[PDB]
């Protein structure tokens, strides 16, 4: 078919993030694993440039759609896309402050997916909860997957973050995933992928790092036909 | 006695929509019932000005949040608002198209809920998918509910409609539900309400007649560690 074939074993992945927040460059490298059947995976992320000038929380969606556990009967696009891979173009528009714009590419290196991401963060308030690291947790969410022309899928999401003063920071996530090949590919119908994300500190690592576990799984909701069933 | 105690019965409801779309005034008088434990209900939507001048599709959300089946661990704000009732302010932004701004009030009549809605449909493309009635299916969605201050909840959603050309027109839905009381009211934490709707264009006479079914229920999602 046959991308899903390749992902039937336990994979590794490596992430290279080249970023810019308010004219200030930063670099994040990450690695982790996803044991079959997937949909529950951990990543260790380190800031190469010493200290991250912002909250690690908004970085969560940067540090693997092919690792979400999909169901039998919904087509797993991210996985279909290999070996030739896929690009992602993504904007996160945070209400009353900055926009995160990223470009991703994914290559398959045996049982290792290599991810290369440039990210720009502009218009972020230097006093705000993101720059001042006042973000407490990442809200779970129901992202919405929509077929998009012949080579793409579109992921729309509301990503919310709890602040220190108990309020809420809301990002408008819009993410295009484009298949790199020219061959026809199966494009899944409208569905959902649920994403729950927790960021933790490992006492082991002295570096500016996070460990991050994501539980992600796809699902659909039964359409009604008057009765329906 | 307030809140969900009022909803422990079977119930009807009534909707009055005063609207306009790029000038064209229209009134809708929808009516329906919902049956304990609710979460699945029908509405009979009747235009009192004859022809609805745009698709009936984007009107789905206009034609009952208290009729969602809420599980036990999740506070049902829409119901807790009663008797005092609830007001709603709602914007829906269509990519490359117009914006529905609506304002709803709700009032309890023992076991009947009265809905009073105004809605401006503006900036809509005169030849686009909505005005040309080119939208086939209303896609289902997982609306996101968030606490919004001491007396409100915010509902965010992407409401997709499939077009004639087979593609999808996307609505960015932002709706603020505010308790109209001074009394203290529980605000639920972040959750979701799954909404599934099916629309049908019931036997046509001097008026646009429309039937709609909606399954709608609230849920949380897992948490880690
Ligand atoms: Na599919
Ligand atoms: Na609750």
């Amino acid at each position: 078919e046959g991308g899903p074939a390749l992902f039937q074993s336990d994979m590794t992945f490596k992430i290279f993030i080249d970023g810019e927040v308010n004219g200030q460059k930063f670099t994040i490298v990450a690695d982790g694993s996803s044991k079959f059947p997937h949909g529950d995976f951990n990543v260790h992320a380190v800031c190469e440039t010493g200290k991250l000038p912002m909250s690690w929380k908004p970085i969560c969606h940067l540090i693997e759609p092919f690792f979400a556990r999909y169901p039998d009967g919904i087509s797993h696009f991210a996985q279909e896309c290999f070996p030739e891979g896929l690009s992602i173009d993504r904007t996160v528009r945070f209400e009353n402050d900055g926009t995160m714009t990223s470009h991703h590419t994914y290559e398959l290196d045996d049982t290792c997916v290599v991810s290369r991401i440039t990210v720009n963060c502009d218009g972020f308030q230097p006093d705000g909860p993101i720059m001042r690291d006042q973000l407490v947790d990442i809200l779970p969410n129901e992202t919405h997957m929509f077929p998009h022309g012949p080579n793409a899928v579109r992921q729309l999401a509301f990503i919310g973050f709890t602040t220190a003063d108990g309020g809420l920071m809301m990002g408008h996530f819009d993410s295009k995933m484009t298949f790199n090949g020219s061959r026809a590919i199966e494009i899944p119908g409208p569905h959902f992928v649920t994403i729950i994300t927790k960021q933790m500190r490992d006492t082991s690592d002295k570096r500016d790092h996070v460990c991050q576990r994501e539980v992600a799984y796809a699902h659909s909701v039964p359409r009604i036909t008057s009765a329906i069933g």
Side-chain angles (χ1 to χ4, degrees), chain A residues 1-225 227 229:
Chain A
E1 165 76 302
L6 303 172
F7 291 93
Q8 291 168 5
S9 64
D10 296 8
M11 310 224 135
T12 53
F13 62 87
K14 231 196 172 69
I15 330 297
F16 309 93
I17 307 263
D18 175 5
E20 179 191 317
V21 55
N22 295 354
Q24 181 175 174
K25 272 185 66 191
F26 66 87
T27 302
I28 300 177
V29 50
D31 73 81
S33 287
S34 194
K35 337 175 287 200
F36 184 90
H38 300 135
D40 195 344
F41 64 105
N42 291 8
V43 62
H44 186 67
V46 168
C47 175
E48 165 197 289
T49 38
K51 163 165 259 178
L52 229 215
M54 67 184 249
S55 169
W56 274 101
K57 271 79 194 174
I59 298 282
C60 65
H61 69 273
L62 264 26
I63 63 178
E64 316 282 299
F66 31 85
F67 287 150
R69 179 125 97 99
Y70 258 65
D72 25 72
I74 263 70
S75 169
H76 197 168
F77 187 80
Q79 291 185 357
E80 278 292 88
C81 274
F82 292 88
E84 309 95 300
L86 81 149
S87 282
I88 291 186
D89 306 284
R90 173 187 295 178
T91 51
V92 194
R93 203 203 332 120
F94 284 100
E95 279 173 354
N96 331 112
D97 84 298
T99 289
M100 294 185 67
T101 306
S102 52
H103 186 81
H104 316 31
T105 57
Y106 302 89
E107 301 311 352
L108 233 208
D109 199 323
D110 182 35
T111 49
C112 184
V113 191
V114 183
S115 182
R116 283 169 143 76
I117 302 169
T118 197
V119 64
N120 318 102
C121 311
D122 287 286
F124 283 96
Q125 312 279 62
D127 207 342
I130 284 170
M131 299 312 284
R132 300 202 50 204
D133 195 23
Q134 303 182 306
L135 254 32
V136 160
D137 56 44
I138 309 153
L139 268 24
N141 65 96
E142 291 283 341
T143 81
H144 295 39
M145 292 293 195
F146 303 104
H148 192 86
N151 56 355
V153 76
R154 189 194 192 176
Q155 198 186 19
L156 290 163
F158 309 100
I159 311 181
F161 300 92
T162 300
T163 60
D165 66 309
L168 225 105
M169 169 75 77
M170 179 62 48
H172 290 68
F173 179 107
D174 190 0
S175 200
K176 176 152 97 212
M177 288 167 54
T178 298
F179 172 57
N180 295 328
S182 48
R183 66 158 164 81
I185 187 159
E186 246 283 34
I187 302 154
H191 61 284
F192 305 96
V193 34
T194 302
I195 307 167
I196 315 89
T197 308
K198 178 64 184 316
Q199 274 179 10
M200 305 140 297
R201 307 80 205 61
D202 191 6
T203 332
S204 167
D205 190 351
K206 306 289 149 293
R207 291 167 305 170
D208 191 14
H209 74 291
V210 281
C211 196
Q212 189 183 290
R213 176 171 180 195
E214 175 172 289
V215 171
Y217 53 90
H219 63 93
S220 47
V221 333
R223 286 86 74 251
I224 86 253
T225 50

